[PDB]
Amino acid sequence: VLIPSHAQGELTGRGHKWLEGDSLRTHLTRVEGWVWKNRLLALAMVTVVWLTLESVVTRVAVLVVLLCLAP
Amino acid sequence: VLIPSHAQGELTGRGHKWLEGDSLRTHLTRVEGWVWKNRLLALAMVTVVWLTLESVVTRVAVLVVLLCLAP
Amino acid sequence: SRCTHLENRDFVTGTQGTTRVTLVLELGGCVTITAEGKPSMDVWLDAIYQENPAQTREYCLHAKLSDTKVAARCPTMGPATLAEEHQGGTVCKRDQSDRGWGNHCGLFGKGSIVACVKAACEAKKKATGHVYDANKIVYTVKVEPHTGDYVAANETHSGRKTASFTVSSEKTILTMGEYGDVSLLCRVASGVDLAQTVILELDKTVEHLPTAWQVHRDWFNDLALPWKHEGARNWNNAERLVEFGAPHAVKMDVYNLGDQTGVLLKALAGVPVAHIEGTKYHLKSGHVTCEVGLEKLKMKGLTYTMCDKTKFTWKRAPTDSGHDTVVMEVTFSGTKPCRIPVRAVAHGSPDVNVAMLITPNPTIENNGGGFIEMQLPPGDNIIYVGELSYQWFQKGSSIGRVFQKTKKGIERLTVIGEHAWDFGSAGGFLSSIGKALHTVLGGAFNSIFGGVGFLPKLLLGVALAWLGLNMRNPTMSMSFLLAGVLVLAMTL
Amino acid sequence: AVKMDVYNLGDQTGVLLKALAGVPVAHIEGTKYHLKSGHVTCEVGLEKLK
Amino acid sequence: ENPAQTREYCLHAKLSDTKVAARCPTMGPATLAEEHQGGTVCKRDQSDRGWGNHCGLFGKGSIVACVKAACEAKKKATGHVYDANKIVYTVKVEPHTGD
Numbered sequence: 001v002l003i004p005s006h007a008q009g010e011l012t013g014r015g016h017k018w019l020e021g022d023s024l025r026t027h028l029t030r031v032e033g034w035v036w037k038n039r040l041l042a043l044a045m046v047t048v049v050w051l052t053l054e055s056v057v058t059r060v061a062v063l064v065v066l067l068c069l070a071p
Numbered sequence: 072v073l074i075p076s077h078a079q080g081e082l083t084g085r086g087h088k089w090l091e092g093d094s095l096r097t098h099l100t101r102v103e104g105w106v107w108k109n110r111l112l113a114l115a116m117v118t119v120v121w122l123t124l125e126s127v128v129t130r131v132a133v134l135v136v137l138l139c140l141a142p
Numbered sequence: 143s144r145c146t147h148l149e150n151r152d153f154v155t156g157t158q159g160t161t162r163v164t165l166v167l168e169l170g171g172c173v174t175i176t177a178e179g180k181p182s183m184d185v186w187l188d189a190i191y192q193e194n195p196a197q198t199r200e201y202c203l204h205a206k207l208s209d210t211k212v213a214a215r216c217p218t219m220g221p222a223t224l225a226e227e228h229q230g231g232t233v234c235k236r237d238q239s240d241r242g243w244g245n246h247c248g249l250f251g252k253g254s255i256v257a258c259v260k261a262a263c264e265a266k267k268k269a270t271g272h273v274y275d276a277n278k279i280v281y282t283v284k285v286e287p288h289t290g291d292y293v294a295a296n297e298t299h300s301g302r303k304t305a306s307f308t309v310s311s312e313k314t315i316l317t318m319g320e321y322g323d324v325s326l327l328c329r330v331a332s333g334v335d336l337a338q339t340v341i342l343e344l345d346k347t348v349e350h351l352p353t354a355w356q357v358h359r360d361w362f363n364d365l366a367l368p369w370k371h372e373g374a375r376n377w378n379n380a381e382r383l384v385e386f387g388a389p390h391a392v393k394m395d396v397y398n399l400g401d402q403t404g405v406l407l408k409a410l411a412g413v414p415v416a417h418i419e420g421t422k423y424h425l426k427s428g429h430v431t432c433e434v435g436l437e438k439l440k441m442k443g444l445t446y447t448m449c450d451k452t453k454f455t456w457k458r459a460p461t462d463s464g465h466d467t468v469v470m471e472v473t474f475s476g477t478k479p480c481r482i483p484v485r486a487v488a489h490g491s492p493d494v495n496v497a498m499l500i501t502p503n504p505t506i507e508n509n510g511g512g513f514i515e516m517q518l519p520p521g522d523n524i525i526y527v528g529e530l531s532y533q534w535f536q537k538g539s540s541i542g543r544v545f546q547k548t549k550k551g552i553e554r555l556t557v558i559g560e561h562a563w564d565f566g567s568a569g570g571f572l573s574s575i576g577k578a579l580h581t582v583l584g585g586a587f588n589s590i591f592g593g594v595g596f597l598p599k600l601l602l603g604v605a606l607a608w609l610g611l612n613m614r615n616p617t618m619s620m621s622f623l624l625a626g627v628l629v630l631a632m633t634l
Numbered sequence: 635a636v637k638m639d640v641y642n643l644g645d646q647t648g649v650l651l652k653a654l655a656g657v658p659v660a661h662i663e664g665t666k667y668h669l670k671s672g673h674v675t676c677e678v679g680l681e682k683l684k
Numbered sequence: 685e686n687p688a689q690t691r692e693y694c695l696h697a698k699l700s701d702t703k704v705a706a707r708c709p710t711m712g713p714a715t716l717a718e719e720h721q722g723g724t725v726c727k728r729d730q731s732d733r734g735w736g737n738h739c740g741l742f743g744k745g746s747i748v749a750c751v752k753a754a755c756e757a758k759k760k761a762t763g764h765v766y767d768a769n770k771i772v773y774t775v776k777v778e779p780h781t782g783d
């Protein structure tokens with residue numbers, strides 16, 4: 001079984017709607033779930049910033065991407 | 072409201088399990104979700120390859136990551 | 143021989159001297175012990191259960207909502223309260239409406255509002271968890287010897303002896319008829335890690351679902367569902383199924399999230415199931431390091447006569463066993479009991495016995511006998527049961543069965559096999575160091591990397607390998623080892 | 635080897651309800667299927683008012 | 685007022701008439717009459733028959749199971765569409781009468 005969400009549509013809305021206050025904040029609780037429960041691996045992410053190729057623009061574009069990879 | 076999966080857990084097994092040929096392939100079918108519904112984006116990632124990058128090694132690390140990030 | 147019934151079978155030799163075989167009995171597995179001078183045994187982990195164990199956090203999947211009570215106030219006229227805000231089993235959320243004048247407030251603005259429901263649970267939708275106490279857990283090892291009889295799955299074998307294995311409970315001397323006896327030194331808490339093993343139970347009376355599962359405890363206590371213990375009238379975290387919207391100046395409406403069963407069932411993707419039989423909560427996966435002594439055993443019926451070579455009849459034709467061995471069933475018609483002159487030749491003008499007999503000294507009893515298992519080299523072979531003979535072309539290969547034993551040995555090394563380096567017996571600079579090289583490796587790779595997922599197991603490892611490519615110091619270029627580790631170790 | 639067991643995936647209601655994050659709701663007053671959000675263009679003539 | 689409707693989806697499958705055909709590895713992969721109706725789900729597979737279930741040979745025992753995938757009561761995810769023939773946009777206008 002697969003269902004993707006209705007994040008694709010997000011068509012209208014000026015009446016009543018669903019949990020859009022906590023829809024994008026589902027993922028913001030997931031990734032913080034990857035942080036607060038895997039603190040050793042969360043501190044493993046620092047070894048890419050100040051040790052590997054720290055080119056200015058391509059720091060955050062690797063960091064936030066790698067944090068948001070883990071579903 | 073979110074229950075995390077057993078992507079995380081994965082204790083043991085010589086008995087019977089739920090979906091071992093689909094746990095890895097739920098995400099692969101979701102990629103088919105971001106391809107079959109988004110054939111225009113299937114064309115939009117071509118211009119990533121041959122017109123912008125010129126960085127043959129890192130091209131796969133762009134394409135695959137930008138597909139898997141799409142939930 | 144119950145080991146013939148299922149695919150996951152392991153053969154363990156016994157030399158002259160080696161009498162205390164340390165096995166690792168895996169659930170849904172079967173180990174055939176062979177020994178030069180001893181009759182062959184079949185020892186297996188049969189069941190892992192505990193009768194009505196201490197149940198942990200229950201959960202609610204489908205919410206029952208009734209007596210919905212909403213009160214609203216003006217902004218500066220004493221924000222809204224209810225008597226059911228503080229009652230048990232109630233979910234409330236304080237909010238602020240937009241009070242106009244039809245709802246009759248003297249002022250505009252953000253008048254406070256609250257909605258409360260008697261958030262009970264729907265019947266028989268409880269996701270009940272259970273944990274195994276090591277003080278009262280029961281491992282079960284049934285030992286069947288190769289009697290030469292054959293018994294199917296519908297029937298139970300007579301000589302199949304059974305011993306229960308708890309902590310009030312050490313090692314069993316099983317009376318194996320006239321074969322001698324066998325000892326089963328098993329260990330209780332050094333099987334399944336019972337601290338991080340939670341038996342999830344949904345409605346067992348629902349027909350088309352597995353009865354129980356086996357989930358990780360830190361996974362189990364990080365669920366965002368309403369939870370309680372046994373006998374609790376009310377729930378904790380009951381607000382994780384009940385949702386509210388914005389109000390419209392008088393009422394905020396309540397919207398249940400319905401049933402969340404399938405959300406749980408998707409979330410058990412790759413979890414071993416478990417069985418419930420009344421009071422017993424069996425497992426369907428697991429392992430145990432039972433040291434089995436071959437000490438009291440002796441070859442039964444050495445004093446028996448030899449059967450007539452003429453009077454052998456096939457009750458059943460030979461065939462491939464699935465484990466690159468040959469099984470069969472003969473019937474002797476003359477004087478019983480006696481010993482069966484089983485030999486197999488190589489079909490190269492041999493008159494040479496190549497019958498690596500799994501069951502040594504096959505005998506015909508007065509009530510049965512004839513089930514013979516043997517391993518053969520590849521090619522044409524003739525298996526002589528006395529003067530009775532039959533052609534056999536063995537489908538295996540010369541290195542194919544060795545490659546099959548390595549194909550066993552690799553898939554043995556699952557998380558069962560991560561612990562199971564004691565499948566031999568005190569190898570010293572082979573097996574005891576085999577524990578050392580893999581326990582500090584797999585154990586450290588269970589502290590971290592346990593709770594990461596197949597996607598980062600297949601991508602973060604290759605990313606760290608790619609950082610091995612993009613490395614300044616050539617001395618620090620041994621972070622390319624993470625390619626060889628993280629793409630191979632935790633990818634099976 | 636005898637009984638390949640078949641397993642339902644149970645109810646998938648909440649699964650679908652997690653897929654409706656950001657949806658506008660719609661009321662049903664029996665016969666009518668109301669929307670709660672939308673848009674239209676109208677023209678308002680006030681020359682016939684006083 | 686009650687438009688047309690599209691694809692419905694059943695969120696809770698009602699399984700019934702669950703039958704499994706199995707055969708010894710070279711003893712004819714078994715036909716089932718239950719495959720040939722709609723609302724039935726079947727899947728072929730290769731198990732490993734022993735002599736614990738009364739065969740003559742071992743190997744890849746052919747096996748297939750079937751069910752009748754009905755639906756549960758009022759557990760339909762009914763999709764609708766619009767026909768502009770019966771669509772109504774209601775506009776109420778209220779002046780300022782002083783009340």
Ligand SMILES: *[C@@H]1O[C@H](CO)[C@@H](O)[C@H](O)[C@H]1NC(C)=O
Pocket residue numbers: 296297737738
């Ligand atoms: C057990 O024995 C009977 C007697 O012949 C046999 O017909 C039956 O198939 C067996 N039971 C099962 C479940 O296979």
